[PDB]
């Protein structure tokens, strides 16, 4: 717990270099400001220097539960070879929890001006509909209608 607590703080220095990951971290932090989703995934340095075994115990004690978990596999197997192993091992799982707050959307701007670098990674985005909304099929096309390009395609 204490060793890794240094490993984490080593990486938040590293991800300063991961400029792409900087942006999406900023981006999610704006549109979903005030909500949980604006949080990063690795978290602030501070909480990593205050974290406890018990908060993890509680966190573990609430989210890792059968009704909200999935097992899946593929390859040269059979679905019934597997079904016994879940009935063997995970049958001892605690099979018994808040639901979602609708995370709103914001139209806001953020800008970490820094002239000392070569270039500027930039991002822009809008509200997305979500998973079950069927028009996501259409949008994945339009992203591909516009497509992509990076400094290598001889076309």
């Amino acid at each position: 717990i204490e060793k890794e607590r240094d490993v984490i703080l080593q990486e938040l220095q590293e991800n300063d270099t991961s400029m792409r990951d900087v942006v999406f971290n900023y981006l999610h932090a704006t549109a979903f400001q005030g909500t949980p989703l604006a949080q990063s995934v690795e978290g602030p340095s501070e909480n990593v220097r205050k974290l406890s075994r018990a908060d993890l115990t509680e966190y573990l004690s609430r989210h890792y539960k059968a009704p909200r978990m999935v097992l899946a596999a593929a390859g040269g197997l059979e679905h019934r070879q597997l079904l016994d192993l879940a009935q063997k091992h995970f049958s001892g799982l605690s099979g018994t929890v808040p639901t979602l707050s609708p995370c709103r959307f914001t139209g806001s701007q953020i800008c970490h001006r820094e002239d000392g670098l070569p270039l500027a990674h930039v991002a822009i985005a809008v509200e997305g509909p979500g998973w079950a909304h069927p028009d996501n099929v259409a949008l994945q096309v339009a992203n591909a209608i516009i497509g992509h390009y990076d400094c290598t395609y001889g076309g």
């Binding site: 914001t106 139209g107 701007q109 953020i110 800008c111 970490h112 001006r113 002239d115």
Partner: protein, 74 residues
């Protein structure tokens, strides 16, 4: 000249919001009016006293001129 080659900036963050996500005139009465007075208390003392004298010189300028056309005892 334009944006791009003006100067240097380092380690500066800017937060800002759409207009649509905020009322145009919040705290206009609630917060503006003291700021008006604060803006006033910093400027009146170096602006008024000229105009104060002007009002007086505008006053005495007429009265003495008013008396001069009125006759003398002779």
């Amino acid at each position: 000249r334009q944006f791009g080659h003006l100067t240097r900036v380092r380690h500066v963050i800017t937060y800002s919001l759409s207009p649509f996500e905020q009322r145009a005139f919040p705290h206009y009465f609630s917060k503006g009016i003291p700021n008006v007075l604060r803006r006033t208390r910093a400027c009146i003392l170096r602006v008024a006293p000229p105009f104060v004298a002007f009002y007086l010189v505008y006053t005495w300028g007429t009265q003495e001129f008013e008396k001069s056309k009125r006759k003398n005892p002779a």
